[PDB]
Design a protein around this ligand. Structure first.
Ligand SMILES: NC(=O)c1ccc[n+]([C@@H]2O[C@H](COP(=O)([O-])OP(=O)(O)OC[C@H]3O[C@@H](n4cnc5c(N)ncnc54)[C@H](O)[C@@H]3O)[C@@H](O)[C@H]2O)c1
Ligand SMILES: NC(=O)c1ccc[n+]([C@@H]2O[C@H](COP(=O)([O-])OP(=O)(O)OC[C@H]3O[C@@H](n4cnc5c(N)ncnc54)[C@H](O)[C@@H]3O)[C@@H](O)[C@H]2O)c1
Ligand SMILES: COc1cc(O)cc(/C=C/c2ccc(O)cc2)c1
Ligand SMILES: COc1cc(O)cc(/C=C/c2ccc(O)cc2)c1
Lengths: 363, 362
């Protein structure tokens, strides 16, 4: 609609500067309980009906709350996050932010990924880490961190993230729930789309937590045995799982022996030398023809302006912000690390879901 | 594995990640890399852009280059910069990818981030939009809504204009953003808007040091100006030929003239406060006088266009800053004017960057 190229140029610059407004608006609609009412609603609902349904608490300024929610949802409607219908009101009205007319709102399909059921296959626990204030604050310190060649997180909090989490119980839970949430989704998709668990006697899951992933995998492959390998303090908290041995240890020291080792979102935390050491421990732990299964995004060789590529470079920036030298890798960069660790010139890539690939390297 | 379910999920993650572009552009500006992009003659690698932007010896110069490379690659995937890739005659150590070296050029949009070309930039406004103090309020929307309060006030315990009195650096950031936007809009007004023709006296409510009036008089030499602003702002203004500085509150009175300019005033305020301002404009105006409202105009329905999204984005900015400040539709502006006494006579002239000049007539 801009009146010339100069005008459209200016508005695009403002748009680029303002991209934080959508995520922060979504967070509020979620936290208010409005997004869950949209998701269970049988028809479109006005801001007033959404607030009445979402809030049990008696509000001091209920009319202000309703118009504010109307403004939040109208903004998300402009971004196709929700559907909006407008009707004429016969009467007077003040639980909408316009003269004659009342908006009613329905969830778009994308909204199901924000569900608070948590495991209805939602990414909400991941989203709450993505938009966590403690983590977001690091993004304001990128400049100085680059100048020192440090992680923005380190430059913000004085120390690496994994150290800091030991000192912040609440942030630690947010982080672990996000990890667990993404793990659950990808594990399910793996059992739908990936065939590389066929023929395995023993699978070693590094960073397996309580061993949920191995348990779900054994649900489909009943004769496979699992080793759940994680830090001693994580293993101490792990209840028995049938067919899974919990083993405490550092992946930098050793990996337990097996037919395959699973690394999900491990390598992208670490620089190339650390990755090579992890893959060398995988290599010594495997019998010949054994495999490493890497569950990671793969960035394209060039910066393609696609939805998937943008999300992969967005994850690269998250890694820069969090760890500094943690990073997302191309297929070739993954191949090179594996060959450095001793693996053959034999590469498989199976696309799974949500930008995650299963890359398999073979001894 | 890639279907509608997959696209849906990626879309969800994209919506949650929208902050990454703005934060990355900020870093690239603040490192001085954007300015090197804007003066460059050709695509430059991260290494070249760092060497050119940074005076100091860095402790970890190769880490800094590879980090900038990653920032720029991300911006390339969003079409903010142009990237080309060439095979390294050897082995790099200042690009993230060893085979190959990326070089980058500014896209046209980057001119809007310039630190001082001789043209228009929105960089002072952008520094306000991405200022940490202001951004921190957006993390407090849920509790401010439940209380019916402005997120900003819930975050800092006072109204934004009161807070600026307590934070001189933020006060500068705010005023420079307003002055930047006002400068661009006043020049576009002199280009496109014809409603200053014929006016004896123009009253600029919130006119600061009188720069707007000074510029308009530069084109309309027989017009006189009344620069109306708070006494403390007027105390600081130097004399302006053909302009009288007057101190006061727009809630008490407006100086009389043929036209009153209200730029980004009404959107700070609720309907009751707007009606007070407009009733004061009405009584102040001589007959056939006009209020000239310089605001964004939100469409009647939430259209998914670049311009509409920009207007609802400013709406949420007003929500966050003031709570009850808000963007309006044409109909809502008309209705406030009619409540203040103005006639059923409405003009709208599109100016630039989503701003309209709306005129109401006594
Ligand atoms: N960059 C490196 O090469 C590097 C980094 C850290 C530790 N190490 C080596 O590791 C040994 C132990 O030192 P430490 O206790 O600081 O390191 P650690 O065992 O705590 O390892 C560091 C990080 O790696 C991850 N990790 C380690 N083992 C894991 C496992 N089984 N599952 C999931 N994640 C795991 C965790 O995120 C942890 O914070 C030392 O010999 C040390 O040199 C090497
Ligand atoms: N939106 C609302 O919060 C709301 C609601 C209903 C009524 N009101 C009315 O507004 C009053 C609150 O305002 P206040 O008492 O804090 O006063 P105030 O005028 O001192 O408020 C500060 C702001 O007023 C503006 N201002 C006032 N006169 C100006 C002038 N001549 N030139 C430029 N800018 C000028 C500036 O934007 C300044 O930052 C209420 O007492 C009532 O009259 C406001
Ligand atoms: C914080 O207080 C104020 C007061 C005011 O009068 C205007 C603004 C405008 C902000 C803005 C943000 C994003 C954009 O893309 C374009 C403008 C903010
Ligand atoms: C904070 O530390 C970590 C460690 C880790 O292994 C993964 C992530 C992933 C974040 C992320 C962000 C945005 C998305 O869209 C998708 C994932 C973050």
């Amino acid at each position: 609609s801009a009146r010339n190229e100069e005008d459209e140029s200016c508005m695009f610059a403002l748009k680029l500067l303002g991209g934080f407004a959508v995520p922060f608006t979504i967070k509020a609609v979620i936290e208010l309980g409005v997004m869950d009412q949209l998701l269970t609603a049988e028809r479109a609902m006005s801001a007033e009906e959404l607030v009445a349904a979402a809030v049990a608490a008696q509000l001091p300024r209920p009319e202000v709350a309703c118009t504010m929610v109307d403004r939040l949802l109208r903004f998300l409607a402009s971004h196709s996050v929700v559907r909006c219908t407008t009707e004429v009101v016969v009467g007077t009205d003040d639980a909408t932010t316009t003269t004659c007319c009342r908006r009613s709102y329905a969830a778009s399909p994308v909204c199901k990924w924000f569900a608070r059921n948590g495991v209805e296959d939602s990414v909400l626990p991941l989203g709450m880490m993505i938009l966590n204030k403690t983590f977001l604050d690091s993004w304001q310190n990128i400049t100085d961190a680059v100048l020192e060649g440090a992680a923005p997180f380190e430059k913000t909090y004085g120390m690496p993230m994994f150290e800091y989490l030991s000192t912040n119980g609440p942030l630690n839970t947010v982080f672990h729930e996000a990890m667990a949430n993404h793990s659950m989704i990808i594990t399910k998709k793996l059992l739908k789309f990936f065939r590389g668990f066929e023929g395995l006697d023993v699978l070693v899951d590094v960073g397996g937590g309580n061993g949920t992933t191995l348990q779900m995998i054994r649900g489909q492959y009943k004769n496979m045995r699992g080793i759940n390998y994680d830090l001693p303090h994580v293993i101490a908290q792990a209840a028995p799982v049938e067919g899974v041995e919990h083993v405490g240890g550092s992946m930098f020291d050793n990996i337990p022996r097996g037919n395959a080792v699973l690394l999900k979102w491990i390598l992208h935390d670490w620089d190339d030398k650390a990755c090579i050491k992890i893959l060398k421990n995988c290599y010594t732990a495997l019998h010949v023809r054994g495999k490493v299964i890497v569950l990671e995004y793969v960035v394209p060789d060039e910066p393609e302006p696609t939805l998937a590529a943008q999300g992969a470079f967005e994850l690269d920036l998250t890694m820069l912000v969090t760890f500094g030298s943690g990073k997302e890798r191309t297929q070739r960069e993954f191949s090179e690390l594996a060959m450095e660790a001793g693996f053959s010139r034999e590469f498989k890539a199976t696309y799974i879901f949500a930008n995650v690939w299963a890359l398999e390297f073979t001894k």
